[PDB]
Design a protein around this nucleic acid. Structure first.
Ligand SMILES: [Mn+2]
Ligand SMILES: [Mn+2]
Lengths: 336, 336
DNA sequence: GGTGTACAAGTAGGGAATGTCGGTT
DNA sequence: AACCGACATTCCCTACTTGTACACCTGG
DNA sequence: GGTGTACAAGTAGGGAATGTCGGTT
DNA sequence: AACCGACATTCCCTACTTGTACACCTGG
DNA sequence: GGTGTACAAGTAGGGAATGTCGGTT
DNA sequence: AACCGACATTCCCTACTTGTACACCTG
């Protein structure tokens, strides 16, 4: 009856009764019948038993040689880590299924890259690196974030649907969503805030623009609202290089307010707290959220800003230095 | 130095040597030592040996109870098959991790749903059903497909990048891509085709628009090219309800050419061979493609439309029949 | 409309695990 | 009888293969 | 910033697997 | 001695738990 | 975002309708 | 008073323009 495993047990038991090899074998036929391993394989078990080898496991078997080294497929990734299996395959003379396996066998996983706002010129980066160095230099001499009042502009549609993920048996349809229309109803939000909260915001009506003209009016209203909400206020103002924000007219509206405008490189939303922090948070919050009327957008926004904590804003602003640092370490290339 | 499995082999060995249960135990202690099991076990083993049962492995142990039933979790999916695990867990009173497991244990996988072009109206679904019904009723009677000349219009940006997928160790990042610009240079393409190939295409200059005026012009230009390339043509025209396609003026330009316009319910790009099949194949081929010159866009298209085997277009058109059935059986809801 | 990844199942080798057998004591 | 060495036979485990399912793309 | 899934590791508890022991022959 | 039945003790295997990593999101 | 059709409302124009004026008995 | 033709206005009624909905195709 017994298998190589059950057999070796016996031969250990037979070993421990001082039975000789050939003796044990006789007992096996006596016990189980003719169909028991040959004497030769008893003599063998015995020969290793005498060494303290009662190790049950077969010694490691034979294996077809790997038709390509690990470090070989690894060094292909070292040139272009974003190739398909089929592409790697035809460089290693194996199938894709083969390249499927060895990538699973090595620690490797497949992950999808980041979208970055803009392709940056050899120069575009230099400007970033500079600004970031400049601000850090200042940051070390004296913390000044406590003086920062930034703000920016962000669309808010009346419907924000996301593609839905369904848990269902294989080869079945996942509940589907209807596209967000590119030319749907939307209202521009313009919001200004500081490390202690949101100072002032305007929610523009559907078709409304922001021009050198209106921008002025706004930061004068901001000023008015600043006077009451921030009594202690000099003051530092951070905003991106909108065609509207660099307006000859507006530049002067800032001088005549005695506001210091922190330098800001273009295509750098990763350095604008309004974008990388405030809005980013709102992005999550707006998911699948509907707005029937312009009134409710303002009501949601109102309760949304209000129901934030204090630290939330504080944290947004104080992550600047960390970003300026990366912004330099990454040498101007996006760092996010 | 035996285990709760190895000793059982031995007890089988002794059973088949006509040794008494207690006798065998005395042999166990003699051979191995003092850490063998009791005689009480040997007696028990023997008692099941005396039957024909020499099955080594245990009986199934005591296991905790299931806190909810597989089919009870199934009722939640029947309601809403797209729910986060956390949400299911709450309804079941178990943890998320708990549900992560029972979904693994059941057949269930996670799938991303579709983007359907437009949210359809109780009415718009009927329009679709009918039109599909009508055309199919006819196709059954007499195949009118080889007479179908159809066309549409589709943008083509000068840079078509895709997020890149990388094979990498966990934690390490994947190569990032610069985002496609919504406002980049983009030439419009107006193309008309037929079961045997493309008849006449018109690649517009950047700014160029299509109005009641220009559409007519093209329809005539089409006809001329149709006379020499398709020397046999009466023509059936298929085109979507673009405001330009549905102008008073144009319907008359179509009459003057004597073309049967097939009815085509609004919001039905899934029934326009131009979109659902020709541009579809294009979207793939256009991936990661850069176009520096307007000439190359034409040079690309020329060589592309050309190298396309004749059947390709044939299949495109002949897939209408099944889309109609499918459009019909699904009562007008989208069906892709 | 195309394409990319992984589960199936089959297959060839590389040796171990085993057997055979003539040689020793 | 007992055990051995050497060459032959059997078996086991893996790195591949082709075949295939299928998630997700793609045009709106 | 925010959140959704799964790999770790620990824990209870339900019985089997095993032990203990005085009762039979 | 041998084996038993009955009650006690130990051990094994799982369905959960909490803790945590981390892909991917989110603003541009 | 582009674009066309369908009325709903808002200006002009050739007609009217009415007004002014000369004439004659 | 009576009455005309000859023009000049005060208006309409229709008639060309705008103005203000929608409707349909792209991502
Ligand atoms: Mn901005
Ligand atoms: Mn179209």
């Amino acid at each position: 009856v017994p298998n190589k495993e059950q057999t070796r047990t016996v031969l250990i038991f037979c070993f421990h009764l001082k039975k000789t090899a050939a003796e044990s074998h006789r007992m096996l036929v006596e016990a189980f019948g003719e169909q028991v391993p040959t004497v030769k394989t008893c003599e063998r078990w015995f020969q290793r038993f005498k060494s303290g080898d009662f190790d049950v496991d077969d010694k490691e078997h034979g294996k077809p040689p790997k038709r390509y080294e690990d470090a070989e497929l690894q060094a292909l990734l070292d040139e272009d880590d974003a190739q398909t299996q089929k592409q790697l395959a035809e460089q290693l003379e194996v199938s894709q299924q083969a390249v499927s396996n060895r990538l699973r066998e090595m620690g490797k996983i497949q992950k999808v890259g980041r979208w970055v706002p803009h392709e940056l010129n050899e120069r575009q980066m230099e400007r970033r690196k500079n600004t970031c160095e400049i601000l850090l230099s200042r940051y070390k001499r004296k913390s000044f974030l406590h003086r920062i009042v930034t703000g920016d502009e962000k669309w808010i549609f009346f419907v924000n649907p996301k593609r839905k993920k369904s848990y269902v048996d294989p080869g079945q349809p996942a509940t589907s969503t209807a596209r967000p229309n590119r030319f749907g109803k939307k209202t521009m939000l313009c919001v200004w805030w500081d490390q202690s909260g949101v100072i002032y915001y305007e929610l523009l009506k559907p078709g409304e623009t922001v021009n050198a003209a209106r921008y002025q009016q706004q930061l004068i209203n901001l000023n008015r609202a600043l006077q009451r909400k921030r009594p202690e206020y000099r003051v530092i103002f951070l905003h991106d290089n909108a065609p509207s924000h660099t307006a000859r007219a507006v530049r002067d509206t800032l001088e005549t307010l005695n506001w210091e405008v922190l330098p800001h490189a273009a295509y750098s939303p990763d350095l604008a707290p309004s974008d990388y922090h405030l809005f980013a948070s709102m992005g999550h919050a707006l998911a699948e959220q509907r707005f029937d009327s312009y009134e409710s957008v303002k009501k949601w926004l109102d309760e949304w800003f209000a129901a934030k904590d204090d630290e939330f804003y504080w944290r947004g602003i104080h992550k600047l230095p960390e970003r300026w640092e990366k912004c330099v370490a990454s040498d101007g290339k996006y760092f996010e």
